[PDB]
Structures are given as structure tokens and as C-alpha cells.
Amino acid sequence: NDDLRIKEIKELLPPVALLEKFPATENAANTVAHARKAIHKILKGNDDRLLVVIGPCSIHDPVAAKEYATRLLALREELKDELEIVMRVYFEKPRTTVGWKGLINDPHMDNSFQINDGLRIARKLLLDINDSGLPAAGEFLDMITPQYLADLMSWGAIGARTTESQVHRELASGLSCPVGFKNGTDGTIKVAIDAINAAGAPHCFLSVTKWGHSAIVNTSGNGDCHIILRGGKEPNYSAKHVAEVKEGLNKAGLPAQVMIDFSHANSSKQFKKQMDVCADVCQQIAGGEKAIIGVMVESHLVEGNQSLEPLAYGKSITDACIGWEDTDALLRQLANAVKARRG
Amino acid sequence: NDDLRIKEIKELLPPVALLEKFPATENAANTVAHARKAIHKILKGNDDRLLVVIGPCSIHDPVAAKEYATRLLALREELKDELEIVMRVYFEKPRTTGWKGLINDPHMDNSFQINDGLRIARKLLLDINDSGLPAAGEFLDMITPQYLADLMSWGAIGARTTESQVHRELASGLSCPVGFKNGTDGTIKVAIDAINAAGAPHCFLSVTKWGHSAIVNTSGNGDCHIILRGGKEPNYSAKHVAEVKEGLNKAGLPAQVMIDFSHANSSKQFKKQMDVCADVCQQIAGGEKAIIGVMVESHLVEGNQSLEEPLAYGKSITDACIGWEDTDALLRQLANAVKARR
Amino acid sequence: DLRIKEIKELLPPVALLEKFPATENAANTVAHARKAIHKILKGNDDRLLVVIGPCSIHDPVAAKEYATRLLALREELKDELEIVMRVYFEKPRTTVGWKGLINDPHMDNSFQINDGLRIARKLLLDINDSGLPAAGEFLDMITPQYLADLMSWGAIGARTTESQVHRELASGLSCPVGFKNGTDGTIKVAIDAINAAGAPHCFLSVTKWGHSAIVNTSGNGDCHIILRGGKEPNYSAKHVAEVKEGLNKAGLPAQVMIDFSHANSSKQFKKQMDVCADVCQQIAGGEKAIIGVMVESHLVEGNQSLESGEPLAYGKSITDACIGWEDTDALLRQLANAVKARR
Amino acid sequence: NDDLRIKEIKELLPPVALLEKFPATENAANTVAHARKAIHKILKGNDDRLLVVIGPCSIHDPVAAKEYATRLLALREELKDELEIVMRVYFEKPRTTVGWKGLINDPHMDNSFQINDGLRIARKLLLDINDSGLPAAGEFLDMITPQYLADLMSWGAIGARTTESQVHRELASGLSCPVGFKNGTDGTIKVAIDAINAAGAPHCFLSVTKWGHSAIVNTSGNGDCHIILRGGKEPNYSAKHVAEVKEGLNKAGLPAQVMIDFSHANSSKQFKKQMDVCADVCQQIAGGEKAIIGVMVESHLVEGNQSLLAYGKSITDACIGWEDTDALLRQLANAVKARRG
Numbered sequence A: 001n002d003d004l005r006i007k008e009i010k011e012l013l014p015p016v017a018l019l020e021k022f023p024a025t026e027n028a029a030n031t032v033a034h035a036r037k038a039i040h041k042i043l044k045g046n047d048d049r050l051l052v053v054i055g056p057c058s059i060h061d062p063v064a065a066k067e068y069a070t071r072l073l074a075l076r077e078e079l080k081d082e083l084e085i086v087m088r089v090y091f092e093k094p095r096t097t098v099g100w101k102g103l104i105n106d107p108h109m110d111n112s113f114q115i116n117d118g119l120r121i122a123r124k125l126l127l128d129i130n131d132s133g134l135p136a137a138g139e140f141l142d143m144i145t146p147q148y149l150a151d152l153m154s155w156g157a158i159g160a161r162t163t164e165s166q167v168h169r170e171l172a173s174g175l176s177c178p179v180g181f182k183n184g185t186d187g188t189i190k191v192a193i194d195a196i197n198a199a200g201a202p203h204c205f206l207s208v209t210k211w212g213h214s215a216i217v218n219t220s221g222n223g224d225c226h227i228i229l230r231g232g233k234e235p236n237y238s239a240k241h242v243a244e245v246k247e248g249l250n251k252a253g254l255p256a257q258v259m260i261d262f263s264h265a266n267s268s269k270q271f272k273k274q275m276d277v278c279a280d281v282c283q284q285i286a287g288g289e290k291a292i293i294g295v296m297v298e299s300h301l302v303e304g305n306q307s308l309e310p311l312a313y314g315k316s317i318t319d320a321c322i323g324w325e326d327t328d329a330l331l332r333q334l335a336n337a338v339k340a341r342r343g
Numbered sequence B: 001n002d003d004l005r006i007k008e009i010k011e012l013l014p015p016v017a018l019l020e021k022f023p024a025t026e027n028a029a030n031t032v033a034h035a036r037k038a039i040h041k042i043l044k045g046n047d048d049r050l051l052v053v054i055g056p057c058s059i060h061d062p063v064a065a066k067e068y069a070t071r072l073l074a075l076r077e078e079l080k081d082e083l084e085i086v087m088r089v090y091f092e093k094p095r096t097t098g099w100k101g102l103i104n105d106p107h108m109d110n111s112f113q114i115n116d117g118l119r120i121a122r123k124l125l126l127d128i129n130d131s132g133l134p135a136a137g138e139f140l141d142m143i144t145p146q147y148l149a150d151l152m153s154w155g156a157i158g159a160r161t162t163e164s165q166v167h168r169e170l171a172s173g174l175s176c177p178v179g180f181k182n183g184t185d186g187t188i189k190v191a192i193d194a195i196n197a198a199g200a201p202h203c204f205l206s207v208t209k210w211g212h213s214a215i216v217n218t219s220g221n222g223d224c225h226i227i228l229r230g231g232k233e234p235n236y237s238a239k240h241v242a243e244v245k246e247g248l249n250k251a252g253l254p255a256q257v258m259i260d261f262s263h264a265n266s267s268k269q270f271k272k273q274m275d276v277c278a279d280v281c282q283q284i285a286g287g288e289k290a291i292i293g294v295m296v297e298s299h300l301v302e303g304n305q306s307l308e309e310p311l312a313y314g315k316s317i318t319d320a321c322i323g324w325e326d327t328d329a330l331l332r333q334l335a336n337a338v339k340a341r342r
Numbered sequence C: 001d002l003r004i005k006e007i008k009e010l011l012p013p014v015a016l017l018e019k020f021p022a023t024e025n026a027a028n029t030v031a032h033a034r035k036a037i038h039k040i041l042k043g044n045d046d047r048l049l050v051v052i053g054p055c056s057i058h059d060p061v062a063a064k065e066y067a068t069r070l071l072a073l074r075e076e077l078k079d080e081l082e083i084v085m086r087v088y089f090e091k092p093r094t095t096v097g098w099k100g101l102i103n104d105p106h107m108d109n110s111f112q113i114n115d116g117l118r119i120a121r122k123l124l125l126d127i128n129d130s131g132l133p134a135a136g137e138f139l140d141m142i143t144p145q146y147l148a149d150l151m152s153w154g155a156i157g158a159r160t161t162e163s164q165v166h167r168e169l170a171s172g173l174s175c176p177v178g179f180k181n182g183t184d185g186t187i188k189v190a191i192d193a194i195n196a197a198g199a200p201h202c203f204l205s206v207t208k209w210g211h212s213a214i215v216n217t218s219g220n221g222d223c224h225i226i227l228r229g230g231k232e233p234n235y236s237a238k239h240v241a242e243v244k245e246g247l248n249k250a251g252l253p254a255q256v257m258i259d260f261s262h263a264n265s266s267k268q269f270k271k272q273m274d275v276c277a278d279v280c281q282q283i284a285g286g287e288k289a290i291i292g293v294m295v296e297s298h299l300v301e302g303n304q305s306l307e308s309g310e311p312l313a314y315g316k317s318i319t320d321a322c323i324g325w326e327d328t329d330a331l332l333r334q335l336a337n338a339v340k341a342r343r
Numbered sequence D: 001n002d003d004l005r006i007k008e009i010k011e012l013l014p015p016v017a018l019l020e021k022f023p024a025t026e027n028a029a030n031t032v033a034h035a036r037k038a039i040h041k042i043l044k045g046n047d048d049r050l051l052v053v054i055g056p057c058s059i060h061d062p063v064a065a066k067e068y069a070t071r072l073l074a075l076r077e078e079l080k081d082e083l084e085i086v087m088r089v090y091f092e093k094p095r096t097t098v099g100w101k102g103l104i105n106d107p108h109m110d111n112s113f114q115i116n117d118g119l120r121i122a123r124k125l126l127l128d129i130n131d132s133g134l135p136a137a138g139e140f141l142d143m144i145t146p147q148y149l150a151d152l153m154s155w156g157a158i159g160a161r162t163t164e165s166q167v168h169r170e171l172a173s174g175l176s177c178p179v180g181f182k183n184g185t186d187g188t189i190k191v192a193i194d195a196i197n198a199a200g201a202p203h204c205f206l207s208v209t210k211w212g213h214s215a216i217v218n219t220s221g222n223g224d225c226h227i228i229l230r231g232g233k234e235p236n237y238s239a240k241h242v243a244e245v246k247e248g249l250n251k252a253g254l255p256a257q258v259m260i261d262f263s264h265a266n267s268s269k270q271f272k273k274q275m276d277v278c279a280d281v282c283q284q285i286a287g288g289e290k291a292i293i294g295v296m297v298e299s300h301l302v303e304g305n306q307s308l309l310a311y312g313k314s315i316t317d318a319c320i321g322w323e324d325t326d327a328l329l330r331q332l333a334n335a336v337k338a339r340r341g
């Protein structure tokens, strides 16, 4: 009657075992605090800077991740007048059917499934990268893994294939960080407009505590949430596309702001089209477009992606990203448009 | 940095304690054991019969629910040769934003006595099985299945969650067979990926019968199927069934489906479940063996009402359903259409 | 590690409280007896508590045939006594032996503790529901949470009266608690127990969820000394003198419960009624301080060797030897005559 | 009907959170691994050396204890041919009724009862000592603290006040290290014999795992236990008492070995008397007492004690200071020389 397609159960460290091995340093604590503050301001129209969330499609090699972090950390500080730069530290990836689930689920890319090692690796990384003063971002996919990492997160996303999940809007309503919801795979923007409304509200659901115990949590509600236009059946980063979502959100009585995602369905998957989308969004930002509050970009040390018989350094094992040299031109190419939007 | 928006945590009863208060009776386990095997044999093409998942949209009064079961159990016998009738015991009922469900606000006032809700919902589930009528629920979250899924013989995944990885991960390790609702928007590529996906072994994090996190390694679920339920327009046609039949095979999957006479297929009006029913029996009697099931929002009294004064007995507090006499006709219609085939 | 051979799962205390909840009546029993005993220890009543029953429960069938017989006398002597059946599920050995029904219910070294706790609590509930309070010994530190709400009086073993953690446990026990003198007949130890248990403590124990935590107790004031013999018996009136004024030197209620079994019987089950005579003589003589007594009683008298391994007889204790029923009615009758004779 | 007297409940970290934050180094694991084996070899009679457990009554300051530890590690390495020296690292102290409970309980010494710091201080201190080659020894009073601390322990005692308990002889029967049971608060050796025998059996009982969940546990049983002579209202360290414990151990069919506390009741409550006992046991050991296999000295940087604040002076029972401690460990290494010939 029970547990008959359940093969094994294996012990899983409680969040406090990670929270006490890898406590957040004074520096760390202050990166996330400030970074969360900064993005709040950008969302309440009290800042005109651009939230840019840029980085690999998915972490899988902490060494490569650190070269990228300290490279981008320089541009966080050179463009800190037009850009609020945040690194794309994605430990979990939702695969269309099957495939590698991210670092935390399978950190030795071998179906070992050393998920305890996973979070150890993940948390130490998230930790280190926050020390340097760079802020981190991630997709929130699992219902349990947030408790181990979220205190180091400064901006999260709910996957497209999860923007309708009640359980996922429930989670968004309690996270301490801002959150972005992606429009639906077909480009439906209301299922996301709906999640913003839910997320902004209090909920009361079942979940796991830092001690690894089932419990009932009540959430205050999170009003720092926005849409992420990722296009769908056809790219939708246009200035008039933006104007639809803009109107739409006014109809729903939510603030008219948007994060454009340059990749996936706005790039026809062609990794290099992030430059095209990039060149189109910058025109909108120069033209005076006040409502483009942020940007998401897929970006690694080296352009392209590889299958999973050895590992090319610095290159994605999942979605395909623009290389670093392109990144530089892209980020400076934003700061300039944000310059052209006020001076 | 920690827990700035979460501001209160309350104690929750572990699965192990609800299975101890309310243990499966030899009868209840018997009904679940046979009912699943019944549906498995159907789903491997080994049985003309039609699985009918029918019952209220949501349960809110255990009393009206035991009455429904005794009635529906009666018909589950009568037509046992043609229909495999499985009652539908749904608690939580997704909505963008009153009622969270029976488990979640069992007292219908935002007291959120999940613990009462859970004791109640399992006890009702228990009794319906001990009487011998299988139940079929809907798995939304990841903690709640650990308290109930032993008394369920079939399950569905909400329309707004068929795309989610976490819910396909959950179907990975269900002992009951699973149905996936196609997309809100009538698409079915998502339903296909979920079947494939839930049919793959998985390893994820989940709560145990004792209320601790752990790692699970599931086996993959082989008894899954799409669930047609409309989109822009309804899609209960046979034009439609022909596409899904095709693509399903193009997907290298068993060209079988289950049609939901409700939701986007009823174009909302609850009585239109009868219209859809009429159309299906044409096919089943026509000779369409790849319609292996149907799903009806059926209560004791037709229509619905709104939470406020007391409530009409036997009339849903959520979606409007056909009442009991529409329920008798519809079941008899289906079972007639069944043994046309011959 | 090196010496932990196996680790099986244990049903949490919440699970038994949920499968065997106090009926409204049983709640009443547990609660009236608990206030009664408090009123004895304050002098505002003058009946004699009487914890009397088997040495160890091992047949839930005989323990109910017993409880109905003992309950039948409980109601009759209502006004003299305050009978509390002896439902000890834990027993300690000088060295190695069978530890009680909870720790080995099928006395076949199966150690089916989960069955043990189910059987123990179900029996415990049957008895409080038919009006008969239960008394027990608190040996283990985790079992209490599975049973404490169905016990109206509790003892701390002669061999654990010094143990800091058994004092801590009584400091937060909700029923009232009796401490035995040292196995060598020392009072200092038991006085200290009362005093330690009289004050609040902060320590680790396990909540009703099977979870370790820090608990702050309040302190238990309904604590008294149990006299149980030593090298030679302390049921005297000479000793009752010393114990009374030693207790007044500590500055504590000058009262004492007297055991009749164990060292005061000199491991001689029948000599239990020789002690009765002496105490009813003190009690019928105007000794007000004898506020309780305890007596090892079963259906048939004597005992049998589980360590045999023939088949077992019905209603005979498998550990310490007890009187049989006929003596117990007679013993309970003289106690009631003594208490009335006392006024 | 319940919790009428439970004033409150705060969360306690699981043993695993601490095993993760202060994992044992390769070195610490080795100090432990080796020290245990040493004490096994002594116990089973295959090494004529003498286990010396020595150190403060209670760690209250960790800095003083780290200084003490270096001083004693020098001595341990210098006498390793006659002596196995492990430090007395006693966190949980058992008071006669109500008083300061020790560093794991109320670390800051003011009734905060910050048990989560305590545990944290107590494990880093133990790890630091073990990492630096010096084995450690402590009291096992609680039923839960062992799970955060056990793995950095080479030897433990069961308190004088808790030798008879089923719940403590159960614990002993699963500890990965040797154990010594003290006699009872009057000189009784019967309790200690029974304890060693019980602690030698396997047991099944309820405990908390490394994760903080109650669960069922079967022990294998612990052969590495022995009696700890500590005295009554009259000290029982003189050869006469030693020969009584000897035959008694034979009657109960146990190896006839012993460890002699120099303190508590063989000190008759004055610390400097610990030196006297030493001379006597040193006589016995050099006479050719193979029965005596270890001792226990309460020793600190500053002799004497204070109440509640001096550095390295004990703040519970009085101990000898470092000049007397150097003297004493040497007297012992010499009787261990005499004894071998």
C-alpha cells in the first residue's frame, strides 16, 4: 500500500549543519543586506540604475565559478553608477524531461547523487562569492534546499515551468530576497501577473525548518516581485512588447516595471542573439524607457556549451552562454544606455 | 539575513502519527491493493473497462461524503463489469487567491488547523476505503502525500503543476497510477514530458513518514497517462482525441487518454458535463478503446454555494457539480457505451 | 560507532498520544488523583495514599483483572485510602535482566519497544478510563513523554535517587514524585533529591516530537521521601523519628511514605503484612506523618522464573514476588481501619 | 494534563551540526585512536605502563586549559615509556544539590544556560587538545551531550553519584572508549562490580542520534571498564583496601586491576593531600603492584580554588598547582620503573 516505488532513503544534513559549518562572514552578511536594499530601491522607482543578473546558466565547477566571480566583481565596481550587478549562481536546473539536475543534486556529474556533498560545495561557494562583495542570485526550484542557501541569496527567480505552481508562489511569499517570476513558456504573461499577486500576500503552508523538521509556516508576503519577460512561442523583448506587459500590469494595478531576459526564448536559443536582444533593449533604455528595471543574461568564462570524455574548462554543461569578452561589451553597453536615460 | 518575511512557525504532526491513529484496515488495504491493480491492467491495454473517477470537486463535510460513497459504492458494484468506479476525494483546491481546502482550513474560517484538517481528511479517506470504494485524490504539495497516499488508488497532478519538475518527481514514487492534466491552454507537449519524466527513476529531497528531510531514490512510475481537460476551447472531440492519440504515439507512448468532462471542457457550466459524456459514449461505443477513463465533478446535489448561516447539505462549496441523479444517468450511459464494443 | 551495533526507528511520543488519547474520564482520574495527593502532602486531607499493585506489569490481561478488583476496593475505601494501582513498565536489575514490558514486551529478547510502548500506553489508558489512577517508576528519560499524562504518581528508583538527571526529570514531572532512600539506608540522598527536584532546572531532554531540545522546568514541590529499607529495615518508628526530624533539619514537610516490600520486607514477600500491622499501629495510633505506603501485590502470590522458560502461569509476578489477592483485600482493609482509627 | 511544570523549550543543535563545524582532524582522530588502544593494552594486561588521568576539576576558562594542555603534553611525551597521560577535560560537573553546572550547561557562568555555546566551546577545546597529540578524558553524566563529544574522548568515568543507574550503565555499554566506574558515596565496591558486569553486557535502549531524534539502539557491550577507587568517610587507597578490591574482583570473576583517585574522598577534601596518596601508591606500584593500572589527580595551574577571578586557579574543588603536578607525574613514572625492574 505504501513506499513501493520508493527505492532508498538516505540521510540528509539539517540546514543547521550547513549553517554552522559555513556561517556567513561579516562581509558576506553585508553584501546580501546592501544588495537586497539596493534592489528594493530600484523596484520602488527610487533608483534608475539597472539590476543586471548575469552569470553561468548553471554552476558545476567552483574553480571556474570563482575566476568569473572576481572578474565580474570588478565590473560590479566600475559600473556601480549605472548597474547593480549580481551573479547567476544557479545550483539547480529544471530539465525538460530528464538530465543533470544541477550541482546540489549531483555534484560529481556522475549520478553519484552526493547531495550532502552537493550543498557543502554549494554553500561554501555561495559563501565565498558573497565575501568578495559580489551578490548572488538563483532559481528557486526545490522546496527544501532554500533553507541551506537563501541567507546568502539577494535575488531569486521562479522557473518558467514553475510560475504557476502554488507551492512555488507560496515559497516566494516568505523569502527574504526579492523574487522574479518568468512569463509562461508560451509567453502567457498573466500566470506570472497572478503569481506576483499571490506572492505579495501572506500564506500558510507546510514546509521544513532549519532543523530539518516538517512544520507549518505563515509568511508575511513579499511585495518585491516582478515579471521576467523571457518570450516564448516568439521573442518578446520589443519596445511594444514591453508596452503590452506594461499596460497589462497597470490593468492588474501592479507597478509597470519589467526585467528582460536576453536568453532562452528571447534568443531563439541561439546563444549569440543575447547581443541582438541586448542591442534592442539598450535602445529602449536610452529612448527614455523608465520601466525596464533589470536584465538577465547567460554568461560564462567561455562561450558555448558541452555535453556530459572530459570537461572543457570554463564552459556550460547545459544552456549555451556568451563568453566573457562578449560579456564585458554587453555590460558596458548597458551602463551607457542607463547613462543616456538621465544625462 | 535569516527569516525576515516568515514570521511564525507551528508544530505539525508527523505522517507516522496519523498512520498510527488511523491505520489501514485489512479491508481498506484490500480495496487499495485491488483497485490499483485494476487500473494497471486497464492501462496496459488488458481490459475493456473504463476507469471513472467521479465525485465532488472538493470535500468539505465528511458526512455528505460518506453518503456519496455508499451510493457510489452501490453503483461501483452494479456496473463493475464495465466501469472501474473510483471515488474522488479531493481536499486542497488550487486557485489564484477563500478556501485553501479541507486539509488546509478544515474549519472554513482561516484558522488553518492543518492538524485537525489532516486527522479529519485521513479518517474520511480511511472509512471510504474500508467500505471498499477506492478513492482518488490530487497531489499538489510534497509534504501532504506522506499522510494519505496509502489509501489512494489513483492520483492527478493539477493543471498549473504538470509542467513543474517537483511534481513529476513526486509521481516518480507514487504507488498509485498517475494522470497528468494537459496545460491550462490545451497544449499537451507538457503532459507527454511528464509521463516520460515520472517514468524515469529520480533522487530528490522529501519528507519521511517521521517529518524529517531525507534523500529519496524513486523507481519511476509506469502507470501514467494524459488527462484531457480543455484550454482556449474544449478538446473532448474525436478530432482532438485523434491528435493526442497520434502525438502520444509519435512520443513513443501508449495511445490512451482520460477525458475530464469538466473544467475547460464543460465550458464552465456544470450541466455541460452531460453533453461531453454523450459525445464520449459515441466513441467508446464507436469502437475507441483508447479512451480508458473519464473524470466527472459530481456531488450529491447539483450546483454550488458560497462560504458564509449554515450550508446546503451535499452541495459543493467550490466548483459546481452535477447532482446525484445526473450522476446515475452518466454512469449508466458510460457503461452502456462500454459493451457496445463487441 | 565502534560499539553501536544497530539503530532502529522509534515512534515519536506524539504518535502514541494521538493513537491513545486520554478519554475525558481518564483525564479526570489522572487529574483528581494528582490534586488529591497534593492535598495529602499539605495536610489539608488525612487519607493514606496507597500505591499498590504488581512488581512489574507483563500481562495486560492480568493487570486489568487486577485493576477492576483493586478499583472495586478503591471506591469502597474512598474515604480512608487513595488507592493507586502499580503499573510499572520499567524495572532495573542489579546487573543484567529483563527491563520491563516496554523494553521487551514479548519477553523473548525481541526488544520490540515500539509494540512495548503501544501496549504500555493502551493498557495505561484503559485503566485511567475506569477510574483507577496509575502509578509508575521513572527510569528511562525518554519513555516519560509517552506516558506522563496518564500517571498520577511517580517514583525514582533507589539506585537513581542520587542521579542528577532523575532529579531534573522530576523537577518538571507534572504528577507528584516519591524518592526512595539509598539502597544502604541513607536519608541524605533522598532529602537532597526532594530539594533538587524542588528547584527549577535547565537541561536537555526529548520533546514529544522525538527531538532533542533544551527544557526549562519550574520545580516540583509535591515531592516526598519513600522509605524502603537498607542493610536492615527503616520502617521502625525509631527511624520514622530520625527521618521526620532529619527532614525538618532540611526544613521540609515532615512526612514519609513507607514501603513494605524490598528491604523492609527483606526480599520476603509475605513479611509485607507484618509491616502493615506495625504501620497501621502507628497510623491507628496517631502517627499523622505516614502520608503514604506502597505494597507489591498481584492476583496469585509468590513469583516464577522467566529464566526457566517453561510455560508461564497466570497472574504471578515474573520479577519481585508479591502477595496474592486474598492478602491484599485484608491488607487494604486494615489500612482503612487504621486511617479511621486515626480519628 | 501535561507540561504543567515545563516552563519553556528552546532549540538545541543536533550533534551533527557540531560534527560538521568542528570535524576531527586527522591528528585528533589519531590521538584518540591511539590513546584508546594504549589503554586497552594496559587493561588486558599486555603493557606494564600506567594510565594517568590528570587535569582540572572543571574547565571553566578555555585559555587556561589550552595552557595546561601544552604543559602536560610536554610531560606526556617525556614519560610515555612509563605513563599514558591523558588530560582531565571535565565539562559537566555534578553538584550535591543546586549550583553551577559546568561549561556545557552555563558557559558564561551566570545562569544564561547558553547550552549551544557550551557545546560549541566544549567541542572546539576538545578538538584543539586532541589535534595537538594530547588525549582527553571526561565525565559522562548527561545522556545527550556524549553524542557531540564522545568521538574526541579516549576514556571516561561514570560519576560517583550515578554508578548504580541502569541508564548510565547502558550508556557505558556502547561508548567507543574505555570507562571507569567509581565506588559509591561510602566506599562500597559492590556497585562498581555490578556496574562493570552490567556495562559488559549488550543492551537495547532509547537514545538520541547524531541528528537529535529519539531512536532505538543495541549496544555490543563494553569490556574495557574497571573500578575507580575514590574512598568513603575513610580513604580506600592503601594496599589493604587494594587487596580487598582485588579478591572481590576475583569473586565476581573480573580482572583484578584498579585505578585510584587521589582526590575527593581519598584526599579527605584537602587538595594538597593528593601528594601523600601518591607516595603510598608509588610505594605499592614500585613494590610490585600489577593490580594498579591508573590514577586520577585533580591538577591545575594554580593550586587551591576560588568561588563566584584568578587565572588557571580551579573554580570548583581545590587542585594541586603545576610545581606539585610535575613532581607527582615523575614519582609515578619512577614507581612504574621500579615495578618493571
Ligand SMILES: O=C(O)/C(=N/O)C(F)(F)F
Pocket (backbone or CB within 6 Å): A094, A139, A157, A158, A159, A160, A161, A182, A230, A261, A264
Ligand atoms: O525555466 C526557467 O525559469 C528558465 N530558467 O533559466 C528559463 F528561462 F529557461 F525559462
Ligand SMILES: O=C(O)/C(=N/O)C(F)(F)F
Pocket (backbone or CB within 6 Å): B094, B138, B156, B157, B158, B159, B160, B181, B229, B260, B263
Ligand atoms: O484535476 C483537477 O481537478 C484539476 N485541478 O486543477 C484540473 F483542473 F486540472 F482538472
Ligand SMILES: O=C(O)/C(=N/O)C(F)(F)F
Pocket (backbone or CB within 6 Å): C092, C156, C157, C158, C159, C180, C228, C262, C263
Ligand atoms: O529500585 C527501586 O526503586 C525499587 N523499586 O521497586 C526497590 F526499592 F525495590 F529497589
